[PDB]
Design a protein around this nucleic acid. Structure first.
Length: 182
RNA sequence: GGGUAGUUUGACUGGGGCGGUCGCCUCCUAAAGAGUAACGGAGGUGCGCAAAGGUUACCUUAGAGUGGUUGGAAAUCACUC
């Protein structure tokens, strides 16, 4: 059995058809779809505190399911007293089935558990179908336990879509039921 | 141990002395082969690396614009040019 995420089932069985009708696309897979979700977290303070970076990496692992990579400093800078090549950030890429499952978990479970959650700004679009927005308190995810955290942390989420514009991606996200603050 | 004896204490230098300089590398002066002076005009150097070597395999920045918890012009990530 090729086990399939419920999001993938929902997409393939409805969303393709509604978007074809709604945007008069000539051929079927002109329809937008999702290629990757990038979860990033920038801990510049890790240059003092290694525990911060280790905790962030581990907590990302529990949140998603796959291990993270610690990015390095592209340039040595003094304003943040950064030496080139130091560990400064940590990111995870989600693709395919894991991507769909994570996005489902997020939208239905973790966005609800945010303090004063009143939707998400439906305008954080880079003009090319890529939607990036932040979450300040990782504790919204029930996966991580409260006691073991060493410092409350946030993280940025970027969703990359095959769409050529923002309208297409916003329509796809709305069909997915993404709680945009509107 | 200058009581006494034998000797040394450089050269370039727009006189000499003082000052500065003396090996080697990069560019201009140098007039489109090469070479070509000056106390002409600007820099570096008497090392480091057991990888920062060899080989195979796999990859590409910086900047401008746009969207994102710290994160601001600028830290990390996505996309366009």
């Amino acid at each position: 059995m090729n086990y399939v995420p419920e999001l993938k089932k929902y997409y393939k069985d409805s969303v393709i058809k509604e978007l074809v009708k709604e945007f008069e696309y000539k051929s079927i897979m002109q329809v937008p779809k999702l290629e990757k979700i990038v979860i990033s977290v920038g801990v510049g303070e890790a240059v003092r505190n290694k525990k911060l970076l280790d905790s962030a990496v581990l907590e990302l692992a529990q949140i998603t399911g796959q291990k993270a990579v610690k990015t390095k400093a592209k340039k040595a800078i003094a304003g943040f007293k950064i030496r080139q090549g130091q560990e400064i950030g940590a990111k995870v890429t989600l693709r395919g089935n894991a991507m769909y499952e994570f996005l489902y978990k997020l939208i239905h479970l973790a966005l609800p558990r945010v303090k004063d959650f009143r939707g998400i700004n439906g305008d954080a679009f880079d003009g090319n179908g890529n939607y990036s927005f932040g979450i300040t308190e990782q504790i919204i995810f029930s996966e991580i336990d409260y006691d073991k955290i060493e410092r409350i942390s946030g993280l940025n989420i970027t969703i990359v879509t095959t769409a050529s514009n923002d309208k297409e991606s916003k329509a796809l996200l709305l069909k997915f039921g993404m709680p945009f603050s509107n």
